[PDB]
């Protein structure tokens, strides 16, 4: 629905979760999500600052 | 005297005045002997080239098996000596009228003319005889005995081009130089 190619946006987002929880605490890879408008690649700049 | 020939194909920009008399009909291509003619003598045939018969219906009987050999030989002989007189008069281009009532040509007559490299056409309108005769300077012919060289015209190039599907017969130049020449121009266009 965002006018992006799903074949490139979907597996780019899997890379954030294929790098699973290393030995360091306070991992911030959980807030990665899709983006409707903006930057390329798509993992959103967190859903954080966005407040959604 | 100013005939407007309509040919579907091409564009309007390709329209130009043809020097000689352009023919609308295409060639027969039943034999397909000659391809391109140069310095050809044009003749206008009004009679029909066929085996010997009057215009009315007839009855031919066969009382002996030897009569068929004379019939099959003499039928082509009537076509042969016509081609000899055509060869004696060195007439290279022939124009035959429509002639719905009597057969204009056949496979036998086309074969003898194929060896002599003589093109032939059909489906000529009766009203266009004034345009072809006055334009090309060729008097018509309606009898084989009165066929001679003085009644025939002349031309430098007589050919039939195939310009992207649109087939047209074109004549270039007339050496008779009669009193009042004629005009012929083909109209080309994308749409009919």
């Amino acid at each position: 629905t965002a006018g992006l190619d799903v074949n490139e946006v979907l597996p780019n987002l899997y890379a954030a979760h294929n790098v699973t929880e290393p030995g360091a605490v306070k991992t911030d890879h959980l807030y990665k999500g899709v983006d409707i408008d903006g930057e390329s690649d798509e993992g959103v700049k967190d859903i954080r600052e966005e407040n959604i | 005297d100013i005939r407007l020939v309509k040919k579907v194909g091409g564009t309007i920009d390709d329209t130009e005045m043809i020097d000689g008399v352009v023919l609308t009909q295409t060639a027969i291509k039943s034999a397909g002997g000659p391809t391109r003619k140069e310095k050809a003598k044009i003749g206008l045939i009004q009679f029909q080239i066929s085996p010997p018969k009057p215009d009315t219906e007839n009855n031919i009987i066969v009382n002996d098996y030897r009569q068929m050999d004379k019939i099959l030989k003499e039928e082509r002989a009537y076509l042969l000596n016509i081609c000899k007189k055509i060869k004696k008069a060195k007439c290279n281009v022939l124009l035959i009228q429509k002639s719905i009532l009597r057969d204009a040509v056949n496979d036998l007559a086309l074969h003898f003319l194929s060896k002599l490299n003589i093109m032939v056409v059909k489906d000529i309108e009766r009203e266009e005889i004034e345009f072809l005769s006055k334009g090309l300077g060729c008097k018509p012919i309606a009898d084989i005995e009165l066929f001679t060289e003085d009644r025939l015209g002349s031309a430098d190039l007589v050919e039939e081009i195939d310009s992207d599907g649109s087939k047209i017969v074109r004549v270039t130049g007339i050496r008779n130089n009669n009193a009042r020449p004629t005009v012929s121009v083909v109209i080309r266009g994308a749409n009919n």
């Binding site: - | 215009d55 219906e57 719905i100 009532l101």
Partner: protein, 191 residues
Amino acid sequence: AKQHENRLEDKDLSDLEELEDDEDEDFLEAYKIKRLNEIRKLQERSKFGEVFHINKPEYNKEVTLASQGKKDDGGVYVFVHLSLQSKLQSRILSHLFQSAACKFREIKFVEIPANRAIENYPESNCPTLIVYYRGEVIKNMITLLELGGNNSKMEDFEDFMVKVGAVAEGDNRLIMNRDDEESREERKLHY
């Protein structure tokens, strides 16, 4: 239902012999005797076969009496041609009469000049084709623009004879039904 009728209906006396080895003799020969009798009737009815170039006194007999025939209502169709040698369609129609005369011997083919037919006839209306039957005019046909005009063919003339009831639809002599031997040869091979 039609598969049983096509064995006899769609085969002449020459074609019925194909089923001599396959079908029963009594079933086949019973119909061959019927079709043989029909062929004999056409031979007796073959009183014509060339164009009758007539003149007027005679018209009052040839054209009309004939149309009565036996008068058993043995009617006879009589195709008249008011010929005019100056017209191009008239000479075409004269050729069709002699061609059809050699085939359909039961139908009478009549020809006469149009100037000698009717007092001061319009030359523009010629050639004229009239069809008599039992003294009554079945068809007063006008010039051949209906039948193609200058491009009239033998197939168009035979089709007109079927419309006026002069020849049956499934007649083996008509060019529409008289398929070529090479045509039937290809059908048997591809069957």
